[PDB]
Amino acid sequence: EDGDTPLHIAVVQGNLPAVHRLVNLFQQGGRELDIYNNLRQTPLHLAVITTLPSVVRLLVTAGASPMALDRHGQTAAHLACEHRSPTCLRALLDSAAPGTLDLEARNYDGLTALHVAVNTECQETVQLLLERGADIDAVDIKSGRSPLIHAVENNSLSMVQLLLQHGANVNAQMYSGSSALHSASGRGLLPLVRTLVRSGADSSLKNCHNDTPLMVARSRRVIDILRG
């Protein structure tokens, strides 16, 4: 019955025993576990949102799909990252059947789980995604920016260091042809300029305006770093 979502309720109330009972009942009647409420959430979405790793494991092992989309096109993985929940992300990645979970999934905004994680600057979720195969250079359709460029624009030295550590292309360019270094240089983000240059950033790379990171240097201190 419409407005009847007993499994959704059991999840939000954190009642694992009830969830188990209901999962058994659903399976006996051929009912899908990926049933939507009026917010377009499945019970699995709710398990991640509530931060219940044990429930996530039960549901996924029982056949709930990690790829079912919510209202904003978020997969379970996307939701674990926006909720800064490494344990739920771990539960999902460990429980999913081989070949059923794709970390390159794009939400309606166009972002991967990695983009979302970097934006929260949660080091734990970023690390785990990267260890499990997430494409570190993936570019979302909206901005054409890699996670590294996102990190530089957010002025997060931690994320910049973490991504470079994991093999990120330091010379990736946006639609306009600007790189991470153009951004750091133009804004005078000294610690970032130092980190990018030592990691191999190309200071001669031209954008669509024909500008190089050297030409947009905000101050003499930046120029000094760029030139060594």
CATH of 1-228, one of 3.90.1170.40, 3.30.420.10, 1.25.40.20, 3.40.50.1370: 1.25.40.20
Residue 164 CA: distances (Å) to CA of 60, 128, 209:
33, 15, 27
Residue 35 CA: distances (Å) to CA of 44, 49, 185:
9, 16, 49
Q: Which residues contact 4 (CB under 8 A, 6 or more apart)?
A: none
Tokens 């001669």 correspond to what residue? 204
In angstroms, the CA 65 to CA 18 distance is: 20
Of residues 105, 204, 213, 74, the one with CA closest to residue 149: 213
How far from each other are the two terminal CA atoms of the chain, in whole angstroms?
70
Over the chain, what HEC string results? CCCCCHHHHHHHCCCHHHHHHHHHHHHHCCCCCCCCCCCCCCHHHHHHHCCCHHHHHHHHHCCCCCCCCCCCCCCHHHHHHHCCCHHHHHHHHHHCCCCCCCCCCCCCCCCCHHHHHHHHCCHHHHHHHHHCCCCCCCCCCCCCCCHHHHHHHCCCHHHHHHHHHCCCCCCCECCCCCEHHHHHHHHCCHHHHHHHHHCCCCCCCCCCCCCCCCCCCCCHHHHHHHCC
Of residues 184, 215, 218, the one with CA closest to residue 201: 184
36, 28 Cβ separation under 8 angstroms: no
Q: Which residues contact 33 (CB under 8 A, 6 or more apart)?
A: 7, 23, 26, 27, 42, 43, 44, 59, 62, 63, 64
Q: Which residues contact 87 (CB under 8 A, 6 or more apart)?
A: 51, 53
Of residues 223, 224, 222, the one with CA closest to residue 192: 222
163, 118 Cβ separation under 8 angstroms: yes
In angstroms, the CA 90 to CA 72 distance is: 22
In angstroms, the CA 197 to CA 31 distance is: 56
26, 59 Cβ separation under 8 angstroms: no
| 28's tokens | 């006996």
The experimental method is: X-ray
φ, ψ at 173 (rounded to 5°): -120, 150
In angstroms, the CA 145 to CA 183 distance is: 12
Q: Where are the domains of the chain?
A: 1-228
Of residues 215, 216, 211, 214, the one with CA closest to residue 225: 214
| 38's tokens | 């009026």
190, 156 Cβ separation under 8 angstroms: no
> Any bridge partners for residue 179, and if so which?
173
